[PDB]
């Protein structure tokens, strides 16, 4: 059940949507696909399923080349956005169409559908038709159809776009329960990073059909591969400060802050392929910004927005000689009037240094939870 996309390339006519997507999903990994462009993730999932041809490269479901295998024999079950429920068939027929067509004994069909309905809380409605059901019940019917089919790999689209929040949460809970109950390989496609953060063993970030980074949720949060991933992960975008590198050591890089005092910080960074005097973009997460009293590096500025959310206060301060307003998050309700001057602290350890191309030098600082 180890899907092993290797050098997979897709070109819609002349437009190459996907180029050299090297994914290695081991057995029983809840790998999630999240990115800004929804076309790329859905196209990738459909090519994995078999509904779409692969322009070049080889695909490996389990341990067998499954590039040209018809979708029926790939051993994969897909949950569509519309759930693909047949209105004329009942719930039992909807979740046992596969067994009916291939040819299965009535007893086997009954046993499978009863087990799936019992574990999905679907037996009390196993006479009705899709029209006489609710949204959550339709979703459970689709998941039950996949469960009855018993696929090696579970594939799931993103129906949250056309769906509201209550059954979005119901979807999230049901998917979590299915994963913990089964433990089989399952791929999921979403556009919201919160869902990927909450439910994933290996997040795949797709950027215009390119593998931006593949890793654990905390791995992406703590050690982003590039500026795109760093900005994408985390609802408040990480503050980016253009810096000039002064001196590079073997384990750290010294950069000059753009703000007029030209302070220099010896932040811990891989310090590989770094030239003195080059242009680089420093990145510090809003949550990691220390109070001005605790940190040696102090960044003065003028407060613009003081959004108070009760649990936390997001302060948008406009640092002189910096275009961006450095957003700052503090727990509790800090009191600050708009237009006043507020100072924040810069922790050198939590500083992400980004090359001019976009790649990020590895942060030598150890972070708990990354394992």
């Amino acid at each position: 059940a180890s899907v092993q996309l290797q050098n997979v390339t897709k070109a819609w006519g002349e437009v190459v949507v996907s180029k050299d997507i090297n994914l290695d999903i081991h057995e029983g990994e809840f790998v999630v696909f999240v990115g800004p462009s929804g076309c790329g993730k859905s196209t990738l999932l459909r090519m994995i399923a078999g509904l779409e041809t692969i322009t070049s490269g080889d695909l490996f479901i389990g341990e067998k080349r499954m590039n040209d295998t018809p979708p029926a024999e790939r051993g994969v079950g897909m949950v569509f956005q519309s759930y693909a429920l047949y209105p004329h068939l009942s719930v039992a027929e909807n979740m046992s169409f596969g067994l009916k067509l291939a040819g299965a004994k009535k007893e086997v069909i009954n046993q499978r559908v009863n087990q799936v309905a019992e574990v999905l809380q679907l037996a009390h409605l196993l006479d009705r038709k899709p029209k006489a059901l609710s949204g959550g019940q339709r979703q459970r019917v689709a998941i039950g159809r996949t469960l009855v089919a018993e696929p090696s790999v579970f594939l799931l689209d993103e129906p949250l776009s056309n769906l509201d929040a209550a059954l979005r949460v119901q979807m999230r809970i049901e998917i979590s329960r299915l994963h913990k109950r089964l433990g089989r390989t399952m791929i999921y496609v979403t556009h919201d990073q919160v869902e990927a953060m909450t439910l994933a063993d290996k997040i795949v970030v797709l950027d215009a059909g390119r593998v931006a980074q593949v890793g654990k949720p905390l791995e992406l949060y703590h050690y982003p591969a590039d500026r795109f991933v760093a900005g994408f992960i985390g609802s408040p975008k990480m503050n980016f400060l253009p810096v000039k590198v002064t001196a590079t050591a073997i384990d750290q890089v010294q950069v000059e802050l753009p703000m007029p005092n030209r302070q220099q910080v010896w932040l811990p960074v891989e310090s590989r392929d770094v030239q003195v005097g080059a242009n680089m973009s420093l990145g510090i997460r809003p949550e990691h910004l220390l109070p001005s009293d605790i940190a040696d590096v102090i960044l003065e500025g003028e407060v613009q927005v003081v959004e108070q959310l009760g649990n936390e206060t997001q302060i948008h301060i406009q640092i002189p000689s910096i275009r961006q307003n450095l957003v700052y998050r503090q727990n509790d309700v800090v009191l600050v009037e708009e237009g006043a001057t507020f100072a924040i602290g810069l922790p050198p350890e939590r500083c992400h240094l980004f090359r001019e191309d976009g790649t990020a030098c590895r942060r030598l600082h150890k972070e708990p939870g990354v394992a």
């Binding site: 509904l51 979708p71 569509f80 956005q81 004329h88 169409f97 067509l101």
Partner: protein, 286 residues
């Protein structure tokens, strides 16, 4: 339920008055043709609206009796029941043929794709509004030439009019295609995932969902074949082979004008209007 000024009442009253006047104007012909049916005379002279009820023309059309008025007997003028039977036969056969030949074309044009889809679609659009008329010369020549070879579709027979009515595939193809497009798109992909050959996916999934549109198309084709004058009038030379809209034209003749008999027959042909108004409208959200 937006608040409106006092002018709303005046606008509503004026609109109701205008609509009532327009409805009276449009219903004048139908109400009249109902009124003639009960008139005793057949030359429509005297009381435009007959207070007296006669039913002489109704049973003449029904053939129930002869309505003895004087010593001499008035036989039934024309076999309206025979007209109805022939029209029903031709319409049913034509509708069955149209549905059978249209369902697969609509499925192919709506759900699956092929390199010639675009050009074929423009072709059907081009040839859809080409009327069955303007080819009656070719149809007459073709049926005259085929009379000696295959008589069952030759001249003066129902085979010819049935074959001519089978040319209405184009109009219904687009309707069934529209319904198929309305049906959700992921069903075929899902059925393929469970392992259904595309023929099975069409037959076991898509076909049972098309029953309402197939019935609607059948009803529409039945009505259209019932109410087609030109082709059936050009063909069907014999009196016994007349259908409706072909044997009906004999009622209004300068030699013997029969307003009462024609109106009785027209009102008796009431099933068409109810069937259309009910099923064709299908109480759809307009």
């Amino acid at each position: 339920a937006m608040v409106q000024p006092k002018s709303q009442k005046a606008r509503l009253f004026i609109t109701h008055l205008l609509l009532l006047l327009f409805i009276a104007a449009i219903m004048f012909p139908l109400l009249m043709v109902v009124a003639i049916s009960l008139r005793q005379g057949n030359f429509a002279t005297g009381s435009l609206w007959p207070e007296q009820i006669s039913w002489d023309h109704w049973k003449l059309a029904l053939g129930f009796s002869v309505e003895q008025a004087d010593g001499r007997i008035w036989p039934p003028p024309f076999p309206v029941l025979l007209w109805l039977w022939n029209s029903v036969k031709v319409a049913g056969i034509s509708a069955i043929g149209i549905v059978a030949l249209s369902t697969t074309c609509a499925y192919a044009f709506a759900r699956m794709r092929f390199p010639g889809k675009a050009t074929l679609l423009k072709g059907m659009l081009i040839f859809q509004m080409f009327p069955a008329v303007l080819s009656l010369v070719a149809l007459y020549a073709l049926f005259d030439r085929l009379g000696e070879y295959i008589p069952f579709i030759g001249l003066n027979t129902h085979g010819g009019v049935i074959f001519a009515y089978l040319g209405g595939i184009a109009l219904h193809v687009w309707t069934i295609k529209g319904y198929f497009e309305t049906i959700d798109s992921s069903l075929e992909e899902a059925a393929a995932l469970d392992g259904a050959t595309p023929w099975q996916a069409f037959r076991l999934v898509l076909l049972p969902l098309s029953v309402p549109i197939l019935a609607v198309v059948f009803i529409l084709s039945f009505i259209a074949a019932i109410t087609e004058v030109p082709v059936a009038s050009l063909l069907l030379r014999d009196v016994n082979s007349y259908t409706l809209a072909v044997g009906m034209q004999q009622y209004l003749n300068p030699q013997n004008y029969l307003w009462g008999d024609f109106a009785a027959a027209a009102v008796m042909s009431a099933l068409p209007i109810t069937i259309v108004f009910l099923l064709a409208q299908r109480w759809l959200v307009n």
